[PDB]
Amino acid sequence: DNHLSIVTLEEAPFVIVEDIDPLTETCVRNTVPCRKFVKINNSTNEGMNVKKCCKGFCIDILKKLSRTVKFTYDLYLVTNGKHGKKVNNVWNGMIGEVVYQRAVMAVGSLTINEERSEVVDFSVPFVETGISVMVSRGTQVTGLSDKKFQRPHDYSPPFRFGTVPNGSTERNIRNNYPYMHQYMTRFNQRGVEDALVSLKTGKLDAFIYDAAVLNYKAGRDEGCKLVTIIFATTGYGIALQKGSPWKRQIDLALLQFVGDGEMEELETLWLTGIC
């Protein structure tokens, strides 16, 4: 059982999805094949797999694991939600794909937290992350724990801040800071790109989100206007099914890459910034 169904999700620079050379339907070298299921219409379960091409930091990790641990894979993009959220006690997203056995593993910008570890096994972390805050340079806030976020209406004017809902960041704020959570829902953003535009154009004062992605974006920012000022340190991990026989070797391989220098090379390749 060496041929593994593996689910991922687009999030640059961890996973980047591009269109396949339309003449050849062949993925250029340095990218791997990935499929996405695309519905014919909204009144039907009918749809077709579109052949795409995948690259990025996590993709490269996958290629390394594939060689070291000796499996082949069929990669696909999740279509039922994003990273993972429990809805009416049912997991969607990549986590869902693993919990309900449609995938052997999930690879990508997938944060390790307690509630997800209850339902999946996680590898060792291979990218360090947590919750950060991105602001326009000059903005004075101490961090997630500041009273400008915790008690926003103590101040005049109240800070405008938000996140992308339905991921690990929002889950964490919901459990820890109930007043902050309900205030923020007004400013929640569809995605990171929307959020950066809001920041740059004075429509948002702060954006709270995954630390790994924010650091990357800050480092690539035109002008170095957007800066980050890490709460709940964790990391990204490979998600596997509970009691997975692949966990042992994957963990060892990931730790080998840290000690070999292979991880440092990937970091330089993909996550280097100017700022």
Partner: protein
Amino acid sequence: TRLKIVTIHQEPFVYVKPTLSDGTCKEEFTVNGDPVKKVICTGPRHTVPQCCYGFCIDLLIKLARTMNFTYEVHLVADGKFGTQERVKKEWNGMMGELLSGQADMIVAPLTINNERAQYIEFSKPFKYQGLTILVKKGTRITGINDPRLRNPSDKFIYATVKQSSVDIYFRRQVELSTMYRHMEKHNYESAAEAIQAVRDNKLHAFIWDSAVLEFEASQKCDLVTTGELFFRSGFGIGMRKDSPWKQNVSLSILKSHENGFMEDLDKTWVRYQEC
């Protein structure tokens, strides 16, 4: 139950002090009037009762209360972290103690790496850090690539701690063969001795855990760290592969990052303002 815990002396994770004459620990208080929790720990193999506290001890107490267990703590008999040495091969230090049954859990700033994980189970990281270099304040160095480390001599002395993961890495790595030949003559038995040695100009540079070194530098104004972090990695709780505790130990650590408890430990033990 009744878990045997091995740990090691290493401020600010584990302070080790004499019991008073009656067999109890000196009542002590943080600024704020909060009681410093202390445990009786036996250590040297003529063993005597002693007093242990700090970040790792608070974590253990947290863990013991959460998962409902009782424990006895001892300091590792040989004073060492643990490497696998030729006799055909055997672990010393806390690694050896855990593998033989002398301990059931290692609760200590024990670095997670490939070689140890082949033999033991590590929790998810309770702390994220890396390596850096501690020098006396006079000294300006680039870091691990500065010529004075790269082309060594008797006119600038550098070292690490023996039977650490860092020591046996320098021994095994081909490009490090010349640095080892220098460090072989200067490596110390303990981090504390090495740190003192730097204060007195008997050692020019000490390569060690950033969590420990940055702490030292925050407390003593005649010390500083230099270079960027390198070999970013974590500390983990160590358990045998068939420990029945491993799931809940890992879940508890994740919970404690997510709910602020670990950041609490960092404010108490790690983030000091003496410099």
